[PDB]
Design a protein around this nucleic acid. Structure first.
Ligand code: MG
Ligand code: MG
Ligand code: MG
Ligand code: MG
Ligand code: MG
Ligand code: MG
Ligand code: MG
Ligand code: MG
Ligand code: MG
Ligand code: MG
Ligand code: MG
Ligand code: MG
Ligand code: MG
Ligand code: MG
Ligand code: MG
Ligand code: MG
Ligand code: MG
Ligand code: MG
Ligand code: MG
Ligand code: MG
Ligand code: MG
Ligand code: MG
Ligand code: MG
Ligand code: MG
Ligand code: MG
Ligand code: MG
Ligand code: MG
Ligand code: MG
Ligand code: MG
Ligand code: MG
Ligand code: MG
Ligand code: MG
Ligand code: MG
Ligand code: MG
Ligand code: MG
Ligand code: MG
Ligand code: MG
Ligand code: MG
Ligand code: MG
Ligand code: MG
Ligand code: MG
Ligand code: MG
Ligand code: MG
Ligand code: MG
Ligand code: MG
Ligand code: MG
Ligand code: MG
Ligand code: MG
Ligand code: MG
Ligand code: MG
Ligand code: MG
Ligand code: MG
Ligand code: MG
Ligand code: MG
Ligand code: MG
Ligand code: MG
Ligand code: MG
Ligand code: MG
Ligand code: MG
Ligand code: MG
Ligand code: MG
Ligand code: MG
Ligand code: MG
Ligand code: MG
Ligand code: MG
Ligand code: MG
Ligand code: MG
Ligand code: MG
Ligand code: MG
Ligand code: MG
Ligand code: MG
Ligand code: MG
Ligand code: MG
Ligand code: MG
Ligand code: MG
Ligand code: MG
Ligand code: MG
Ligand code: MG
Ligand code: MG
Ligand code: MG
Ligand code: MG
Ligand code: MG
Ligand code: MG
Ligand code: MG
Ligand code: MG
Ligand code: MG
Ligand code: MG
Ligand code: MG
Ligand code: MG
Ligand code: MG
Ligand code: MG
Ligand code: MG
Ligand code: MG
Ligand code: MG
Ligand code: MG
Ligand code: MG
Ligand code: MG
Ligand code: MG
Ligand code: MG
Ligand code: MG
Ligand code: MG
Ligand code: MG
Ligand code: MG
Ligand code: MG
Ligand code: MG
Ligand code: MG
Ligand code: MG
Ligand code: MG
Ligand code: MG
Ligand code: MG
Ligand code: MG
Ligand code: MG
Ligand code: MG
Ligand code: MG
Ligand code: MG
Ligand code: MG
Ligand code: MG
Ligand code: MG
Ligand code: MG
Ligand code: MG
Ligand code: MG
Ligand code: MG
Ligand code: MG
Ligand code: MG
Ligand code: MG
Ligand code: MG
Ligand code: MG
Ligand code: MG
Ligand code: MG
Ligand code: MG
Ligand code: MG
Ligand code: MG
Ligand code: MG
Ligand code: MG
Ligand code: MG
Ligand code: MG
Ligand code: MG
Ligand code: MG
Ligand code: MG
Ligand code: MG
Ligand code: MG
Ligand code: MG
Ligand code: MG
Ligand code: MG
Ligand code: MG
Ligand code: MG
Ligand code: MG
Ligand code: MG
Ligand code: MG
Ligand code: MG
Ligand code: MG
Ligand code: MG
Ligand code: MG
Ligand code: MG
Ligand code: MG
Ligand code: MG
Ligand code: MG
Ligand code: MG
Ligand code: MG
Ligand code: MG
Ligand code: MG
Ligand code: MG
Ligand code: MG
Ligand code: MG
Ligand code: MG
Ligand code: MG
Ligand code: MG
Ligand code: MG
Ligand code: MG
Ligand code: MG
Ligand code: MG
Ligand code: MG
Ligand code: MG
Ligand code: MG
Ligand code: MG
Ligand code: MG
Ligand code: MG
Ligand code: MG
Ligand code: MG
Ligand code: MG
Ligand code: MG
Ligand code: MG
Ligand code: MG
Ligand code: MG
Ligand code: MG
Ligand code: MG
Ligand code: MG
Ligand code: MG
Ligand code: MG
Ligand code: MG
Ligand code: MG
Ligand code: MG
Ligand code: MG
Ligand code: MG
Ligand code: MG
Ligand code: MG
Ligand code: MG
Ligand code: MG
Ligand code: MG
Ligand code: MG
Ligand code: MG
Ligand code: MG
Ligand code: MG
Ligand code: MG
Ligand code: MG
Ligand code: MG
Ligand code: MG
Ligand code: MG
Ligand code: MG
Ligand code: MG
Ligand code: MG
Ligand code: MG
Ligand code: MG
Ligand code: MG
Ligand code: MG
Ligand code: MG
Ligand code: MG
Ligand code: MG
Ligand code: MG
Ligand code: MG
Ligand code: MG
Ligand code: MG
Ligand code: MG
Ligand code: MG
Ligand code: MG
Ligand code: MG
Ligand code: MG
Ligand code: MG
Ligand code: MG
Ligand code: MG
Ligand code: MG
Ligand code: MG
Ligand code: MG
Ligand code: MG
Ligand code: MG
Ligand code: MG
Ligand code: MG
Ligand code: MG
Ligand code: MG
Ligand code: MG
Ligand code: MG
Ligand code: MG
Ligand code: MG
Ligand code: MG
Ligand code: MG
Ligand code: MG
Ligand code: MG
Ligand code: MG
Ligand code: MG
Ligand code: MG
Ligand code: MG
Ligand code: MG
Ligand code: MG
Ligand code: MG
Ligand code: MG
Lengths: 146, 97
RNA sequence: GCCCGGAUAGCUCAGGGUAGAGCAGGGGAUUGAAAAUCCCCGUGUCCUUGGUUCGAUUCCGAGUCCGGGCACCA
RNA sequence: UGGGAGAGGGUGGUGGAAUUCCCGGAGUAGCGGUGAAAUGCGCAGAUACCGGGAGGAACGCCGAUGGCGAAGGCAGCCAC
RNA sequence: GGGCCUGACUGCGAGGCCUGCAAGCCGAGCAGGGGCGAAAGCCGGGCCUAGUGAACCGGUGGUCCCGUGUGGAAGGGCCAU
RNA sequence: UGGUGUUGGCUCUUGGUCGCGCCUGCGUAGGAUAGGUGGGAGCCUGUGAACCCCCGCCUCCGGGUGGGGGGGAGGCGCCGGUGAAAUACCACCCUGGCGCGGCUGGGGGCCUAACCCUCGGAUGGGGGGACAGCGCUUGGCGGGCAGUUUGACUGGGGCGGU
RNA sequence: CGUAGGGUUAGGCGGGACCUAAGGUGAAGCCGAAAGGCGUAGCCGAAGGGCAGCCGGUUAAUAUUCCGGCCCUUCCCGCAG
RNA sequence: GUAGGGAAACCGAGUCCGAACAGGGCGCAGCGGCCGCAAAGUCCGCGGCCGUGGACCCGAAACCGGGCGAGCUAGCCCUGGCCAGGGUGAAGCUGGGGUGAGACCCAGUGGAGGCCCGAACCGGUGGGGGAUGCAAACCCCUCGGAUGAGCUGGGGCUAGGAGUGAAAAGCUAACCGAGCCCGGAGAUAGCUGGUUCUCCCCGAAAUGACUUUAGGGUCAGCCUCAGGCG
RNA sequence: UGGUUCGUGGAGCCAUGGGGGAAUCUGGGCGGACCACCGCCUAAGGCUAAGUACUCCGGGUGACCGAUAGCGCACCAGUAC
RNA sequence: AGCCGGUAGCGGGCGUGGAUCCCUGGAUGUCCGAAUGGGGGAACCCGGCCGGCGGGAACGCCGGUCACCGCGCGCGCGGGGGGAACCUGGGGAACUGAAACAUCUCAGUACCCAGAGGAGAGGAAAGAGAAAUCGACUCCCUGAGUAGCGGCGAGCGA
């Protein structure tokens, strides 16, 4: 008897997988414990309706990240800081970089989504990895000048 | 055993025919009937307990139509069955037949 | 009729490369006897036929005879 | 009055050896029994071996030419 | 008693015996293909009279007659047992 | 009482058939452990040989064999001796093995959730448990019950005889 | 016996507006081709439980029933505690 | 009806069996002068007999279905009631005796018991009577039980292959080896009985064969009628 | 297993208590086992007058009865008993 | 033009201003009965609720209402029971016949039950069956005692 697993299970199959079980197992264990559902045609395409709705909401977000990847690797964030020859007096933090990004180029950015542990204390040119969604890591070239 | 609530199957009267002798198709003189008498054939009735709208419902149904019960449980999801008596839940469920 | 099998020394029980063993029998040993026991000795187309093989208890086929087993009977 | 030895008796407990049966395991062509045999038991797996269990009866060594009791009779060990 | 043989035939059968029916019995002669005999001829078991069982149901060999729209087939019929 | 339905989960050990893998096969004659046949003068070996340690092994007790640690130009065939039958390699197979995979069927242990019982408390707890019960089907026992049969002749009927 | 007329008077007697027994019926529920069979509660069900009237007189015919005498029960409303 | 023969295919005044042009089976067919009558055949009426129906009428013992009965009787359930009077004198208890203590013995008290005698009540042993009875089980005398496995009132439950039964196949509404009523139903009866006006002619049989047949049948024999023959 | 003329028969068809269990016209059922060919028809939802049966009731009519007949009842009968 | 039933009589009345009587509709319609407020040994008994009557609170009477089940979104609508035969469906004998008897017959009859209605069933092809055909069902004649079925018996029978 074909059923739709509603959870991963012991040597049975992954969630959403359609598996064949003895009818007794389905009627008196899986179904009354919400662990699965009989693969009737009605809620059988309701499965592919979801495999469609999620796959549309995933590929969407892997697209709305490229709409920042190509829009960030085609600029530079130049940040002025009062600094003596090399060393910044204050610093530039993630929040600073974000605040400066929305300042000049309007781009809004999650500073916690930016890979920078210690605040920058040196002048120079920096390339900092941004992660707005994995497998789309952005290389932001930033320029702390004086 | 009475009546399938789903299919309507009820006991039927059948004969029990006792035969002797070698069938003609095996080279015998033929079969002879040493007795016919009435008997009954019963549906393979079983209980099916399901839980619908937080109530327990029991069906007396022939094994053949056990699948038809859960099919009603599916079709009952689009119904507003809360607060109804278990007896009234059954009536509604059977209405979808 | 059909299936399953047998047949091997007088009796019986075993068995591709042997014709076996026990029991009955013969003599000897033994006792007081009846024996038990001990040694040796015998007693076969292995049912018949045809073929397989270098060879036939074997393997196959065909009869025969007797076992089994099963069903039917106007 | 103070002591002693003792299977003297009765009641309630309790210990180990052995037999038999039962279950598990391992194993195979005989076991048993006698003057010799036979009946009996064993390939439906006995005998012999190991482990587990149940149950009843009798108390090995000490133990003796011993002890105690009126006699009959009294023997594992413990308390009364 | 012996020699050769298979008529212990096939396809029929005039006419009778007997007889409630059904059965039972005798049978010349014609054809086919034979046996014995030189031939005339004889031979359709046995000197004779007991040694037997209607029909139904089924088996087997043959026939190729029927074959449920059609060709086949299943299953029947017919002859023999 | 078998099969099957209601009837499910996890294990363990099995048997039967199917396909493939590697073998096992030693009466006597003789190198030795010769399946049956056929092919065929080359198979091999740095794509690790002649020797030492582990064994799966099966041993008929003589041996056959593989993978491992050995190992760093060696092997055994045609040749032949007695064979019904030459030995290498290949190949299809016989009678058996086991290894894997397939369909399977058998048992045994456990689980709980169907089903059953039970719990003043019940969408629960406890016990039994895929057994039992119940459906369909198989064969069997079956005067408890049912329908019947149980001949005629005959110096009456039975008995006897026929 | 035929025709006709008359005659049976209860808050307290007996039963009901009270209780339950076997049993019957039976919301819940269970079962059965149909008819129907079960079934806890509940309801019904008495010669059992419970509950307030004794004596006398009177009629042709009733009387613990009418009358007389002396007693008593429940319900309703009110007053008092 | 006009065509039959063959298991059939099929052929056809033929056909089947067969090798047959053999044999055999079964088939094939008007009066007198084109006109009449008669006739194949068929239709309707009438009569005899036969088949199917209850089939000439009456009669079982029985079988089956659906109901009605435990106001009789049998058992059980619930709730009530009844058993005069007399007799016997268990245990225990008390006291006395007894003994180491006891067992035990004696007396008194006590009032047990499917105990005794006997009415009511419940029975029904023997005899007599009764026998178209007083009575479809009674009467007289006698006799059994009578605190019990006792009797009895009222309220209930169990029934037909079923109940109930201290068991007799007893009882289940005056006959129970399977109740009663209605129905299937006009069951069936090879048996027994019965079968109705008149006259005239003829006139049997009681044997054979076969028969779950023997006092019943089929055929033959023997009777009768119609047509034909002579 | 039942239905049909079909009693297991060569046993199809129609129905279905049990087990297994599809497809949507290039799908499916039938034409008497089965196969091929050739045809017929579209299952697993329902409704549908009329022609047909009967006679409690009304009328019409009898080569129907005429009080033991005709209904059990001509009448105060489903009564008396 | 007579009348107050069968039914005369006593005693009293009515009718051409149309009686009696006949047809239709209406009103009344105790109690029981499917019986339905509850109970019950049918025609009896006992209640709740609203309203009324009496002097009326107790008590009683009068009118209305109050069973259960199903269906529809407390309210509505429907069901219940009866009917001589007839009809359909669910169950379903035996005597008898086979001159015994079991398959078979009687017979899907008798009968029980449920249901329906003036009828009921059936009905618009997943049909027939051999015609290159027909064209729902029902009913009558015929086909036909045919085809077949059958201890190939008795019989049954499209
Ligand atoms: Mg900063
Ligand atoms: Mg049967
Ligand atoms: Mg055949
Ligand atoms: Mg038969
Ligand atoms: Mg038969
Ligand atoms: Mg039966
Ligand atoms: Mg059930
Ligand atoms: Mg279930
Ligand atoms: Mg559940
Ligand atoms: Mg099914
Ligand atoms: Mg199924
Ligand atoms: Mg002292
Ligand atoms: Mg053991
Ligand atoms: Mg022995
Ligand atoms: Mg042995
Ligand atoms: Mg063995
Ligand atoms: Mg013991
Ligand atoms: Mg001494
Ligand atoms: Mg001679
Ligand atoms: Mg000679
Ligand atoms: Mg010659
Ligand atoms: Mg000849
Ligand atoms: Mg002749
Ligand atoms: Mg003759
Ligand atoms: Mg005759
Ligand atoms: Mg003769
Ligand atoms: Mg000649
Ligand atoms: Mg000649
Ligand atoms: Mg010559
Ligand atoms: Mg000549
Ligand atoms: Mg001749
Ligand atoms: Mg001679
Ligand atoms: Mg016969
Ligand atoms: Mg024949
Ligand atoms: Mg043949
Ligand atoms: Mg032909
Ligand atoms: Mg056909
Ligand atoms: Mg054909
Ligand atoms: Mg062809
Ligand atoms: Mg042809
Ligand atoms: Mg043939
Ligand atoms: Mg034939
Ligand atoms: Mg034949
Ligand atoms: Mg079974
Ligand atoms: Mg199972
Ligand atoms: Mg377990
Ligand atoms: Mg288990
Ligand atoms: Mg559990
Ligand atoms: Mg558990
Ligand atoms: Mg539970
Ligand atoms: Mg539980
Ligand atoms: Mg549990
Ligand atoms: Mg089971
Ligand atoms: Mg089966
Ligand atoms: Mg059986
Ligand atoms: Mg018997
Ligand atoms: Mg009997
Ligand atoms: Mg009996
Ligand atoms: Mg029995
Ligand atoms: Mg009997
Ligand atoms: Mg007989
Ligand atoms: Mg006789
Ligand atoms: Mg006689
Ligand atoms: Mg005599
Ligand atoms: Mg005589
Ligand atoms: Mg005499
Ligand atoms: Mg005489
Ligand atoms: Mg005799
Ligand atoms: Mg008087
Ligand atoms: Mg009076
Ligand atoms: Mg008073
Ligand atoms: Mg009152
Ligand atoms: Mg009362
Ligand atoms: Mg009460
Ligand atoms: Mg109910
Ligand atoms: Mg019932
Ligand atoms: Mg009841
Ligand atoms: Mg009760
Ligand atoms: Mg009350
Ligand atoms: Mg009552
Ligand atoms: Mg009462
Ligand atoms: Mg009372
Ligand atoms: Mg009282
Ligand atoms: Mg009173
Ligand atoms: Mg007083
Ligand atoms: Mg007085
Ligand atoms: Mg008086
Ligand atoms: Mg007084
Ligand atoms: Mg007074
Ligand atoms: Mg003919
Ligand atoms: Mg011919
Ligand atoms: Mg001719
Ligand atoms: Mg001729
Ligand atoms: Mg004429
Ligand atoms: Mg006559
Ligand atoms: Mg006649
Ligand atoms: Mg008749
Ligand atoms: Mg007649
Ligand atoms: Mg009978
Ligand atoms: Mg009988
Ligand atoms: Mg009855
Ligand atoms: Mg009754
Ligand atoms: Mg009584
Ligand atoms: Mg009584
Ligand atoms: Mg009574
Ligand atoms: Mg009493
Ligand atoms: Mg008394
Ligand atoms: Mg007294
Ligand atoms: Mg007394
Ligand atoms: Mg006394
Ligand atoms: Mg005294
Ligand atoms: Mg006294
Ligand atoms: Mg005393
Ligand atoms: Mg006392
Ligand atoms: Mg004393
Ligand atoms: Mg004293
Ligand atoms: Mg005393
Ligand atoms: Mg006394
Ligand atoms: Mg007494
Ligand atoms: Mg006495
Ligand atoms: Mg006395
Ligand atoms: Mg006396
Ligand atoms: Mg008496
Ligand atoms: Mg008596
Ligand atoms: Mg008397
Ligand atoms: Mg006397
Ligand atoms: Mg007398
Ligand atoms: Mg008398
Ligand atoms: Mg008397
Ligand atoms: Mg007297
Ligand atoms: Mg007296
Ligand atoms: Mg007396
Ligand atoms: Mg007396
Ligand atoms: Mg007394
Ligand atoms: Mg007495
Ligand atoms: Mg007493
Ligand atoms: Mg008593
Ligand atoms: Mg009493
Ligand atoms: Mg009583
Ligand atoms: Mg009484
Ligand atoms: Mg009873
Ligand atoms: Mg009863
Ligand atoms: Mg009876
Ligand atoms: Mg009866
Ligand atoms: Mg009985
Ligand atoms: Mg008694
Ligand atoms: Mg009576
Ligand atoms: Mg009577
Ligand atoms: Mg009686
Ligand atoms: Mg009697
Ligand atoms: Mg009887
Ligand atoms: Mg009877
Ligand atoms: Mg009788
Ligand atoms: Mg009676
Ligand atoms: Mg009567
Ligand atoms: Mg009746
Ligand atoms: Mg009737
Ligand atoms: Mg009849
Ligand atoms: Mg009749
Ligand atoms: Mg009669
Ligand atoms: Mg009879
Ligand atoms: Mg007779
Ligand atoms: Mg008579
Ligand atoms: Mg007469
Ligand atoms: Mg005359
Ligand atoms: Mg004369
Ligand atoms: Mg004669
Ligand atoms: Mg005669
Ligand atoms: Mg006879
Ligand atoms: Mg006789
Ligand atoms: Mg006789
Ligand atoms: Mg006579
Ligand atoms: Mg007779
Ligand atoms: Mg005659
Ligand atoms: Mg004559
Ligand atoms: Mg004459
Ligand atoms: Mg004549
Ligand atoms: Mg004449
Ligand atoms: Mg003359
Ligand atoms: Mg039929
Ligand atoms: Mg059939
Ligand atoms: Mg049939
Ligand atoms: Mg058929
Ligand atoms: Mg079908
Ligand atoms: Mg089915
Ligand atoms: Mg198509
Ligand atoms: Mg298709
Ligand atoms: Mg079909
Ligand atoms: Mg089909
Ligand atoms: Mg077909
Ligand atoms: Mg068709
Ligand atoms: Mg068609
Ligand atoms: Mg259609
Ligand atoms: Mg249809
Ligand atoms: Mg209609
Ligand atoms: Mg119309
Ligand atoms: Mg119509
Ligand atoms: Mg009329
Ligand atoms: Mg009239
Ligand atoms: Mg007339
Ligand atoms: Mg007349
Ligand atoms: Mg009269
Ligand atoms: Mg009359
Ligand atoms: Mg007269
Ligand atoms: Mg008359
Ligand atoms: Mg009338
Ligand atoms: Mg009348
Ligand atoms: Mg009369
Ligand atoms: Mg009369
Ligand atoms: Mg009257
Ligand atoms: Mg007057
Ligand atoms: Mg006047
Ligand atoms: Mg006028
Ligand atoms: Mg006028
Ligand atoms: Mg007018
Ligand atoms: Mg009116
Ligand atoms: Mg009422
Ligand atoms: Mg009532
Ligand atoms: Mg009021
Ligand atoms: Mg007043
Ligand atoms: Mg008032
Ligand atoms: Mg008032
Ligand atoms: Mg009132
Ligand atoms: Mg009221
Ligand atoms: Mg009713
Ligand atoms: Mg109605
Ligand atoms: Mg009917
Ligand atoms: Mg019917
Ligand atoms: Mg019917
Ligand atoms: Mg019956
Ligand atoms: Mg029958
Ligand atoms: Mg019968
Ligand atoms: Mg009979
Ligand atoms: Mg008949
Ligand atoms: Mg008969
Ligand atoms: Mg007869
Ligand atoms: Mg008889
Ligand atoms: Mg019969
Ligand atoms: Mg029958
Ligand atoms: Mg009949
Ligand atoms: Mg029938
Ligand atoms: Mg009728
Ligand atoms: Mg009409
Ligand atoms: Mg209609
Ligand atoms: Mg249509
Ligand atoms: Mg048609
Ligand atoms: Mg057409
Ligand atoms: Mg059409
Ligand atoms: Mg039309
Ligand atoms: Mg015709
Ligand atoms: Mg038939
Ligand atoms: Mg028949
Ligand atoms: Mg038939
Ligand atoms: Mg019939
Ligand atoms: Mg028909």
């Amino acid at each position: 008897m074909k059923v739709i697993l509603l959870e991963p299970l012991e040597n049975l199959g992954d969630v959403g997988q359609v598996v064949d079980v003895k009818p007794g197992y389905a009627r008196n264990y899986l179904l009354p414990r919400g662990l699965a559902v009989l693969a009737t045609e009605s809620n059988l395409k309701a499965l592919e309706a979801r495999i469609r709705a999620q796959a549309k909401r995933l590929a969407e977000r892997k697209a709305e990240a490229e709409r920042l990847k190509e829009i960030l690797e085609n600029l530079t964030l130049t940040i002025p800081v009062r600094a003596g020859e090399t060393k910044i007096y204050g610093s530039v933090t993630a929040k600073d970089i974000a605040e400066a990004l929305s300042r000049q180029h309007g781009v809004t950015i999650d500073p916690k989504r930016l890979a920078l542990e210690k605040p920058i204390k040196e002048l120079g040119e920096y390339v900092l990895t941004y992660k707005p969604h994995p497998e789309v890591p952005i290389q932001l070239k930033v320029s702390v000048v004086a | 055993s009475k009546v399938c609530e789903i299919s309507g199957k009820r006991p039927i009267v059948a004969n029990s025919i006792q035969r002797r002798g070698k069938a003609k198709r095996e080279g015998g003189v033929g079969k002879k009937t040493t007795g016919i008498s009435k008997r009954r054939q019963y549906p393979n009735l079983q209980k099916v307990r399901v839980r619908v709208a937080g109530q327990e419902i029991t069906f007396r149904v022939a094994a053949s139509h056990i699948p038809k019960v859960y099919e009603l449980v599916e079709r009952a999801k689009g119904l507003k069955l809360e607060g109804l008596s278990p007896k009234e839940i059954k009536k509604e469920l059977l209405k979808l037949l």
